[PDB]
Amino acid sequence: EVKVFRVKGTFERLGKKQPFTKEYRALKEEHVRELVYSDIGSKHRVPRTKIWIESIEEIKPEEAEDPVVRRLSL
Amino acid sequence: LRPAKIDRDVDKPAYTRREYIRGAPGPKITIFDMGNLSAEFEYEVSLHAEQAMQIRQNALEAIRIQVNRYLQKNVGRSNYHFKIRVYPFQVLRENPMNGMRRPFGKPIGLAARVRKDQKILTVWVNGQHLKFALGAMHRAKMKLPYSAYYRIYDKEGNDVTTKVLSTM
Amino acid sequence: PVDAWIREEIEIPEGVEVTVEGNTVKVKGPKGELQRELKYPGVQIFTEDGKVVIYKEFPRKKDVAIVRTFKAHINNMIKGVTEGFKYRLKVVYSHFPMTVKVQGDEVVIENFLGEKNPRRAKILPGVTVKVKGSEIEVEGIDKEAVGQTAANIEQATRITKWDRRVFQDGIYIVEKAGKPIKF
Amino acid sequence: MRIINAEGLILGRLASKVAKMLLEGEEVVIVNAEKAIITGNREDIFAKYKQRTELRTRTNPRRGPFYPKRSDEIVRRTVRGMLPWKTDRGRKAFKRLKVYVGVPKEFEGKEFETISEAHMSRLATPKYVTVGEVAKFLGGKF
RNA sequence: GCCCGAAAGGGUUGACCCUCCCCGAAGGAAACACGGGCGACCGUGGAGUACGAGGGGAGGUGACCGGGGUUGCACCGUCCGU
RNA sequence: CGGAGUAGGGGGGCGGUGUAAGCCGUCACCCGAGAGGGGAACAACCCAGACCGGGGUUAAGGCCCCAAAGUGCCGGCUAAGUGUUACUCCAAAGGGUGUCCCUGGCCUUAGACAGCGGCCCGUCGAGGUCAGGGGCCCCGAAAAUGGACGGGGCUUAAGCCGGCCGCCGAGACCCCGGCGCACGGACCGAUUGGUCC
RNA sequence: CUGGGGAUAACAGAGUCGUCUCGGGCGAGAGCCCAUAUCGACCCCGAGGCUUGCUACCUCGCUGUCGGCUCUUCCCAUCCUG
């Protein structure tokens, strides 16, 4: 089964923190963690220790807020 | 006089003590508070240093005049409590040029030593002149040797720059 | 990205036929064929119930802009084989009335500012020029050809050496395919 | 002799493969040298090659450099760049190669290899130019 | 690679070379059977096997070898004294 | 007790002075007085301290060709040949929302225009607009013989970010054999010894 | 006069750029009125090494010479010519 996931965490770059919430399709949460690390590392030059994941919770395909995922879910 | 890239760094020791420094000069700057000095305003627009600096008194005075003229022409004395917080204590010296024989500089001026995230100057204002206070901020920023950034402070000690900027 | 399957659709009108073979789009109407190459990686064009569809599968902003540019072009081709396009030009002169003639694939302007030498302007294949009094009309099916012919005629009369407030003689555009020009 | 059609191939990757073959000991013939491609912006590419062409010894122009203007010779020169030209091994390898514009009668209706790790569908961005375009800008008869 | 030979060096009381048997340090394969991983790959058994500097043996062969002069190819190399 | 040499030091890190280059001190890792493997070449930057002959494994770093080993894998960014530079040997204040992202307020069953008329009815119908922040790039950016990412050349890279998987690669480390030295011991000697352990 | 010295100056080179030359940011304002047609204060950020200085790495029997005549070539930070 292809579920849907919502991630909430914090990341630090050059001294300052910043929180984030994201949404993902997947078969697990391990894949979610890996992709989150890669994406934030590319887009803000942040290593994996300065990313702090607080929650990876499964959700529904209608309480989503990201057009791409909302549509890939339909 | 000489460029400020010579004197902006903070790597030399402090050189302040008047009872041992011979031939030391007097301050060109003499006024440090302006406007209405008791009015109990609301908003505090303050400048902070990004990294450590030595600011000369020539620059300090230029900023004084510019900012106060803007504020007097577009706010009016009965508002806009303006203050410069830092006094110039450090003595700048230059080598009287022989060559490098007996090199130990003679005094030429003064500067103020400012540390990382240290308030330089403040403008206290009311709700409906924030934009003019921020103009003063920008004019000042343009005349310093290194970079700075401004904050907006409320009573009770809180930072409100985000939203107060948003609503305008 | 913006979305996942950007899809634009153009409906064909009464008597038009669109062929799509190999990055080349071909349009037939009452009047003349029309061809155009439209290629970009990831962008596809094909035909539906009646429609022309342009489609991309995970686009960025620039890709969106390109899809909609292509759409604009196809619509102009269709409107052109359906009706056509026509531009309008006006002639003004203080002193020295200039004679404008159509002879071959060139427009000839003489007595411009008093010059003994005539200026010349190219006419691109498939565009018709008419001259009625102080007015010129440029009509055809291809929008780019029509506009280019008109711009040629207008640039054939250009002044760099004197103040254009006082010296205003020339030929100027006043209407591009319907929408008039205003300051 | 291995015969390679350069139509639609990326020049540097093609040249790397060919240099390795010549060093291993094979005879090679490249055809359709004008249809190979170079990726990037036209202005930067053309400026590079024009700068190459205007290099000369200030005291005597009969001592070079002699960078090429024609397409077959551009391709040959790139390969030469990928070899040990200062040694006898490299000189013998370079003699084992020939490059041709178009397809001459002698090679008509024959087996044309293709190098898979050079091919432009591999690419994504469409900014590219052609070696023939470069030659024409430099002033070569093809 | 081309050339030359003394016998002070060796060698039919056996030069060189070819094949087979035994022991073997550190180190150490692959094919193959199953499985884990999106993948580049990995784990298990095959297997500490087949190999392996070297240390011994047995038979086929029948005359060179070591050396020297000059020189080709590849890798490396900016003289001596102060 | 006896025999010397040394009284011009330098690289790198710390301090005072000086516009700076430098000058003067300090630490005592290196060069000097130090081979070999790397950084294109390099006194002191990285790995590593050297009797002789052989067999193996690793280090620093590297694997498109020059050139031994990957046109290696997954996710993303760059369009400027930017870059392809650990250091020896790399230009800013100030600007651009050019593109990829995290946030916060005001609008949104009709909003920001676009049109007919004197805020809106029929109009278009779906997301829009203001602020703050980050990543990569762009502007600011001019020199003299003909030319430098080491070269060729490279654009879902042969560039950059976050991670991963296998290989190559020293005189270092393991192993086999041989020479010497130091200490100890036994034995044999015309006398500063020798064979052996 | 002798013996020596780049352990130590003059000069070309090398380093650096206070000074110099060439720029830029903001905008006091001047311009009938109008910041930016033209001129741009005070403060702040830079490029070049053809101006002078600073230093003492190279050279003490290399040549130590300024200017002019002759002859070749390069840059643009353009006076004329497009």
Side-chain angles (χ1 to χ4, degrees), chain A residues 67-68 71-72 74, chain C residues 1-3 5 58:
Chain A
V68 188
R71 304 169 90 87
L72 295 190
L74 289 179
Chain C
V2 190
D3 201 75
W5 63 71
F58 268 111

Side-chain angles (χ1 to χ4, degrees), chain B residues 18-128:
Chain B
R18 291 272 187 172
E19 59 270 35
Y20 303 112
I21 304 174
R22 309 286 162 241
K28 301 297 174 64
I29 183 174
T30 66
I31 301 149
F32 288 85
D33 291 334
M34 287 169 181
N36 199 256
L37 308 170
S38 317
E40 187 218 342
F41 301 84
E42 201 66 22
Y43 291 118
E44 182 183 1
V45 193
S46 311
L47 260 194
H48 302 239
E50 188 79 85
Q51 62 180 7
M53 278 190 283
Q54 291 208 143
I55 303 145
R56 300 151 139 189
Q57 68 184 334
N58 304 271
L60 284 169
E61 192 61 11
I63 292 158
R64 186 178 73 76
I65 277 147
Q66 190 94 318
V67 161
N68 212 51
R69 186 168 295 209
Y70 186 70
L71 293 180
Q72 180 171 347
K73 187 161 79 88
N74 315 338
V75 180
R77 214 190 166 291
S78 291
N79 308 314
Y80 88 84
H81 181 24
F82 182 25
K83 172 183 254 151
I84 284 148
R85 285 160 178 262
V86 294
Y87 195 87
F89 284 119
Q90 200 271 335
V91 179
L92 308 173
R93 59 172 190 254
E94 187 181 69
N95 171 15
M97 48 73 80
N98 192 223
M100 301 301 297
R101 171 172 270 174
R102 198 60 161 268
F104 183 83
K106 282 282 162 272
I108 45 154
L110 311 161
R113 292 209 154 176
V114 160
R115 73 185 172 272
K116 203 186 69 160
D117 288 336
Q118 167 164 12
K119 279 168 189 199
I120 293 157
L121 63 80
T122 307
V123 184
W124 281 276
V125 86
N126 271 328
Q128 64 276 24

